[PDB]
Amino acid sequence: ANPLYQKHIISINDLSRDDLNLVLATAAKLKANPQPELLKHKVIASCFFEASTRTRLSFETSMHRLGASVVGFSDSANTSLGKKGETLADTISVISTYVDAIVMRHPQEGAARLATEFSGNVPVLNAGDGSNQHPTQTLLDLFTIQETQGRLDNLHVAMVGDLKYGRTVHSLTQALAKFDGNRFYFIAPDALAMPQYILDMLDEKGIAWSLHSSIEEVMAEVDILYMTRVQKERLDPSEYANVKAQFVLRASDLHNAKANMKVLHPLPRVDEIATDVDKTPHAWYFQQAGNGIFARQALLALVLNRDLVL
Amino acid sequence: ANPLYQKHIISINDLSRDDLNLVLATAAKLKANPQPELLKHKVIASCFFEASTRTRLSFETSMHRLGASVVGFSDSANTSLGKKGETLADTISVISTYVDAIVMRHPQEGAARLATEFSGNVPVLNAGDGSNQHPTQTLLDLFTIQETQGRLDNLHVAMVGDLKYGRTVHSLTQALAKFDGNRFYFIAPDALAMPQYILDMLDEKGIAWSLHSSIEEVMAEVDILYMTRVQKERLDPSEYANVKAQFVLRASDLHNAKANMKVLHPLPRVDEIATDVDKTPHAWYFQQAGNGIFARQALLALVLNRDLVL
Amino acid sequence: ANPLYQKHIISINDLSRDDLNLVLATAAKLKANPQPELLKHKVIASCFFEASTRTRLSFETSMHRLGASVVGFSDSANTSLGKKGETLADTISVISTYVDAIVMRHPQEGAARLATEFSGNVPVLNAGDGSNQHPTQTLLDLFTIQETQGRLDNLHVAMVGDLKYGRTVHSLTQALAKFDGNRFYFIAPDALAMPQYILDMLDEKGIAWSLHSSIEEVMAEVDILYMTRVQKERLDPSEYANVKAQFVLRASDLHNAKANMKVLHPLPRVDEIATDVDKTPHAWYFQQAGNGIFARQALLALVLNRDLVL
Amino acid sequence: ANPLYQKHIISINDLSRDDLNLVLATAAKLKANPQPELLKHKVIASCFFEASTRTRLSFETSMHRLGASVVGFSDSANTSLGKKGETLADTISVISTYVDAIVMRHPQEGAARLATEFSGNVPVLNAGDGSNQHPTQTLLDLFTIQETQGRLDNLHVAMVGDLKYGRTVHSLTQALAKFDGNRFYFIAPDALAMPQYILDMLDEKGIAWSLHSSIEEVMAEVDILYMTRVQKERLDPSEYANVKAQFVLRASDLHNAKANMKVLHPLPRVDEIATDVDKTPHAWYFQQAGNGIFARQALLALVLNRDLVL
Amino acid sequence: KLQVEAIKRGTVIDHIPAQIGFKLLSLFKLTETDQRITIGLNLPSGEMGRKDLIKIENTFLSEDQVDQLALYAPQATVNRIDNYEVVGKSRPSLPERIDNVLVCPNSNCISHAEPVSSSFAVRKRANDIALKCKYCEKEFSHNVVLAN
Amino acid sequence: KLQVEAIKRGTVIDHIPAQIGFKLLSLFKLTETDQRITIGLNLPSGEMGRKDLIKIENTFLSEDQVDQLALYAPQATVNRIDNYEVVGKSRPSLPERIDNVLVCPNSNCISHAEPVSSSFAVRKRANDIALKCKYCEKEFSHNVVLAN
Numbered sequence A, B, C, D: 001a002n003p004l005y006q007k008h009i010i011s012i013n014d015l016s017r018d019d020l021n022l023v024l025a026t027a028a029k030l031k032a033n034p035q036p037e038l039l040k041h042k043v044i045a046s047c048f049f050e051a052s053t054r055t056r057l058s059f060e061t062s063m064h065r066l067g068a069s070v071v072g073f074s075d076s077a078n079t080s081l082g083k084k085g086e087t088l089a090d091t092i093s094v095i096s097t098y099v100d101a102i103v104m105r106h107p108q109e110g111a112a113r114l115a116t117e118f119s120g121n122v123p124v125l126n127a128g129d130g131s132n133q134h135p136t137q138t139l140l141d142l143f144t145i146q147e148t149q150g151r152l153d154n155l156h157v158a159m160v161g162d163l164k165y166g167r168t169v170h171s172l173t174q175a176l177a178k179f180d181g182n183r184f185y186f187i188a189p190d191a192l193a194m195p196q197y198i199l200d201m202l203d204e205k206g207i208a209w210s211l212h213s214s215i216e217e218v219m220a221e222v223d224i225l226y227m228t229r230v231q232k233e234r235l236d237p238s239e240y241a242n243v244k245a246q247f248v249l250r251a252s253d254l255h256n257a258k259a260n261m262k263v264l265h266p267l268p269r270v271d272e273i274a275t276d277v278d279k280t281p282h283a284w285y286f287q288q289a290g291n292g293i294f295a296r297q298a299l300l301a302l303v304l305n306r307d308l309v310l
Numbered sequence E, F: 001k002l003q004v005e006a007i008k009r010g011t012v013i014d015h016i017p018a019q020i021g022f023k024l025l026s027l028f029k030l031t032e033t034d035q036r037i038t039i040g041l042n043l044p045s046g047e048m049g050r051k052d053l054i055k056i057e058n059t060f061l062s063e064d065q066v067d068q069l070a071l072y073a074p075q076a077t078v079n080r081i082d083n084y085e086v087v088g089k090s091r092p093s094l095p096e097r098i099d100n101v102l103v104c105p106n107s108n109c110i111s112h113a114e115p116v117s118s119s120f121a122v123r124k125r126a127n128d129i130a131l132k133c134k135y136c137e138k139e140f141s142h143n144v145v146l147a148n
């Protein structure tokens, strides 16, 4: 079978460069030639212990594009009998007797990994576990980069915004570091700097990175400008008023951008990207979101089907 | 057509021994040979006026395993227009014009029975009505007993925990009393004793039952040990601290258990069954839950299809 | 100084018969001759961690009738969130630097006792701690009995309703058991009987008590009919319907009552006492509530004023 | 009249060294010789738009200790709904026709200052306005330091914890900087360092300060150890776990402490100070809280009573 | 004999039931000291078949400290040693109070997660020991309290 | 001469630092056996000044079990005894993973509420040991993890 057959998808740290390339190749193929009955008769659990409408809709749409059926829940602080009292372990022990795969998002780190220990032969796909991993966001990001740039090596990638608390930028950086010759530009307020353990990881692999006060320092060289949201609720309102200037993007900032350059953003964007960026050929955050469908399709297909008939 | 065709499934009191055997035979058959298109083009309403995630997921999974489509809701204290104001009668009058069957769970006793009076030719399946009935839990329990013991007559069944307020133990006792030669052991704090009307029912049929202070009195004889949860929220915390001892199960309690003996529990279990029981060959509460799929499939199939092509 | 000067008032079991008499005698005096300036320049904390409007207004009114100032709060809003990780110990360590006495009500048993270990020389009065104690309710009850019966010895006392979970009846029983010749009648559904440990205490002291299924059995010989609330939330509604007749009182039930007989209820009485009782000379629950003022004044005066009141 | 008669008390930056000394001297006097009728017939509004039980009880107790009457409210219930479209301006314009002074706490910075523009001749005292000012906390802190150290000049003051977001440490630093010869030690995680603008202010005045990674570095030379709370909600829990050791204090940390050294904390101290510190002669946080009463009395007296207190 | 040699000065707790010695060490924090400690677990015993044994040099226990052993090691012999000689023998008897080591089984009791020491009044009742929490005033069988 | 006498057969864990011996017994459930155990705490030591010492008869430890001591007693000497002979000595080597005994310092880690054993990846750093939780994938200094 294919290397991802019946595998749990929990952490970018567990996926090799070959794994990533395989998901991306599969996503390209399904995008070009859909297989709406591939997962016919499969039932997949969509378990959002933590609510996330955008991610859930994306995932469930991917399930339906392959013909699978879907059951699930999205949880505020409350759903029903067992929870609050019963362990996540018991919840998974039960649900894994119902379904062919579990997609789960949860507020506590490690929740998806724990689920694998109780799901028996049922594969678990992590849709987000606290501030730890979100591997399918990273896969859709990589797919979008590869599709627009034609490669995942020898790129110039700027990351802008809240680099300290963004689990998606951490994961994207780890994933890109599995490839060769990439160079990073980190543009963030000192209070929201990319963490040292990420910098240490890059140093150990001899991967170049530098800090910059504004995106104009490096705009002419950038292939991918990956913007994140500022977790302003962590910040003092005055402080948030003082930072945003160097981390807000407008169409005028793109004047010396390369033709190939794409602006990415996992969304929601509210303040970070002015609406005037939307019309430029560089705006790619909606296309990026649309790519979630193919990356998530590829993952479900690879995990639940032995052989890739294309 | 089969005896359950287009019938409402409201109460264990309405089902004969033959009815129960038919559902169980059908569940065994679908478990061995699935029919993923049997209910193709059927639309079923999953109406959880009272939220119950485990039961709802189980039921909706059963619907998808037969190829049916699903619409529905799960209600906190609120969903939308009509409810709070409009009668359950009107709600059913409307929904029954949409769908081919209604599965419903509701906080008030008798709610499913009332629904049958307004659903026209649309069958209603009771997923739980207050402290009254939960017939599909009872069917999955019976299916699990029959599958593991090879019979539903001449059994030794211990019931442990909150026997006073457990609607599932009441129903299971009524159902087993439709069969011959069964003997019961009731192990419960005086405050949570099996109710007299249940004991009266057993007496009238000459069915043997006895009370015991601990499961060790009868462990060597037990075929099925059916544990329930203590509704501790009804109890004083000190009182709950004092009772739990004689009604908590650990692996060491199983030392003289018969080879055939299974531990069942409708779940959630939190305190009642120690995790060390889980590894023993006697732990069967997760398998029991998985059997909900086949019992619920059998019911939908029998109610919505005239003839059992196997 | 008087025996209760600067003493904590936590539990009926720490109060001797002499203490109870002293409180009652002081209460009678303040009722006959008000001392509106006795506690002038005292500041008292009214700390209702659990809300209890009737009890709080009663207590604060008592503080004002003696001329004291009041600061306080009422929670049961921050029920287990917002309500900090700050210990009760710290809260009391702080508040005891502000005020001359602490009146507190709390959902956890032992809270007032714990408070005394952090209050320094500031007395704490227990306005109720979970299902444990409520000594000022018992003191107003005893005062009311003493006033209407002329004594606290050699009485025929019936207690009706939820004898199992009523902290107030447990405490009144313990208190009356400090006196001689009292005779108890316990009228309760089996599920809500007076607990064995109370019965053991009476047997140990050689005090006569009997169980009765209805009020009518003993109406002709009782001096005090102490009714309590049966909270529905513990019982099944059908169970509540089935037993309620035996713990409900209406005017016609009083036909053979002694002329001296008073009906007491700590309130609310909504189900248990029919409004037609209100106009009989036996209805004494509102007068009872009124006596709360004099019992609580007496306690505040004794605890905060060195010399006995004249 | 005294310098503070009928003055608003909004910000530490509007209070001179002479004002601070005057408040402290008045506080010492009222502590030594109470004046329980000084503000007889004054009515004061306790307006807690944001709830703050500890601060409110402290303030209201102070009002009562001077014999004033109190009216007020506490919100943080109508948090941004129910809470009207009625302006704070209008609320103050109304309340200032009722009362002789307004004590207010509010979630928005500048609220108390805005209040003064609509309060006419009614003084407003700021009980806290968002992340801006909390001058009476600073006044009780200074009083406590002055009392225990004999002076407010030439002290070695360590501040530990969340120096970045603590309004209370910012204000205490500004206040102490109005005096001469003070030396500061700032112990904080890099992510929570004392802000540059505070540092600039000290440099401008030629005041010495140094940064230190742990308390142990300076324990032997500090006169005041002012600890603050690190609220977890801003930090990642793993980040909180990693830095907490350096801002946590336990009894053994005090081995080499000066005999005069006092440990202060505006409270709650739940994580930062271990309970084993409580019994050392250095623990002074509860005495500190107690001094809130005298600082707040002094302020109320000075603002509402023309002549100096003797 | 003596796997665990005689000491010159201190206390020897003999006749501890098997699987209780380590529990005593944990509960009563006996190893939080710089004094030399020697221990034998699962030693043969004439009286008991097997036993545990704890020696703590230069350390002596009050009669009240000895009594705290009663619930766990009712037949314990607490020996006082000085100049290599046994100077005193005591057995524990039921104390009237047990502080610090027990946990109130009432989950709504204020004692949990508050900075106080647990405390139980001890009441004998033919067979079992009844333990009444100082705080919630609830009384439990000792079997219930010891269970957690 | 020996306060805790020589044994015929089993394992002797020597050169345990003071205040670690009892910790080893607790963490690794060493006393949950019927085998004879003899223990010395705060004994004198040439190499160390003072030490703890644990003897467990008829019981032997794998290299991996010995390595699980590394974090608490890096200078421990594990002696395998047979016929009163030391037939093998070994020192703990920092292992690759540490299971069961550590608690994840991340309060939001799923490991806390749940029926799973803690698990950490181990890697040596210049001045400490980094421990990475299997579940939350956060990495902490051993000084943080061991502090609880």
Ligand SMILES: O=c1ccn([C@@H]2O[C@H](COP(=O)(O)OP(=O)(O)OP(=O)(O)O)[C@@H](O)[C@H]2O)c(=O)[nH]1
Binding pocket: E001, E002, E003, E004, E005, E006, E015, E040, E043, E044, E045, E046, E047, E048, E051, E053
């Ligand atoms: O101080 C001691 C006492 C006893 N032991 C060891 O314990 C075992 C019993 O040695 P004992 O000396 O305790 O025999 P005993 O008959 O007095 O036992 P009891 O009935 O009083 O319980 C022997 O194996 C001995 O080596 C020690 O190692 N040290």
Ligand SMILES: O=c1ccn([C@@H]2O[C@H](COP(=O)(O)OP(=O)(O)OP(=O)(O)O)[C@@H](O)[C@H]2O)c(=O)[nH]1
Binding pocket: F001, F002, F003, F004, F005, F006, F015, F040, F043, F044, F045, F046, F047, F048, F051, F053
């Ligand atoms: O098996 C033993 C070993 C040691 N001990 C006791 O420990 C103390 C030291 O006895 P040692 O024999 O261990 O001395 P040592 O020089 O070898 O010590 P290290 O540097 O290797 O650490 C002595 O007091 C001895 O009685 C025992 O009681 N039993």
Ligand SMILES: Nc1ccn([C@H]2C[C@H](O)[C@@H](COP(=O)(O)OP(=O)(O)OP(=O)(O)O)O2)c(=O)n1
Binding pocket: E005, E006, E007, E008, E012, E014, E055, E077, E079, E081, E083, E084, E085, E086
């Ligand atoms: N210098 C000493 C003397 C005695 N002990 C120990 C040995 C025994 O375990 C316990 C009691 O000593 P005994 O000599 O009294 O032994 P017995 O068997 O005679 O007393 P008992 O009947 O109480 O067991 O104290 C010791 O450790 N060091």
Ligand SMILES: Nc1ccn([C@H]2C[C@H](O)[C@@H](COP(=O)(O)OP(=O)(O)OP(=O)(O)O)O2)c(=O)n1
Binding pocket: F005, F006, F007, F008, F012, F014, F055, F077, F079, F081, F083, F084, F085, F086, F089
């Ligand atoms: N029959 C035996 C032999 C030895 N030991 C113990 C005594 C020592 O504590 C440990 C090691 O024995 P050694 O004879 O090797 O003592 P050393 O001091 O020489 O070895 P090391 O350098 O490791 O300290 O094992 C024992 O309990 N029983």
Ligand SMILES: [Mg+2]
Binding pocket: none
């Ligand atoms: Mg002996």
Ligand SMILES: [Mg+2]
Binding pocket: none
């Ligand atoms: Mg040696």
Ligand SMILES: [Zn+2]
Binding pocket: C110, E104, E105, E106, E109, E110, E111, E133, E134, E135, E136, E137, E138
């Ligand atoms: Zn308790």
Ligand SMILES: [Zn+2]
Binding pocket: A110, F104, F105, F106, F109, F110, F111, F133, F134, F135, F136, F137, F138
């Ligand atoms: Zn973790």
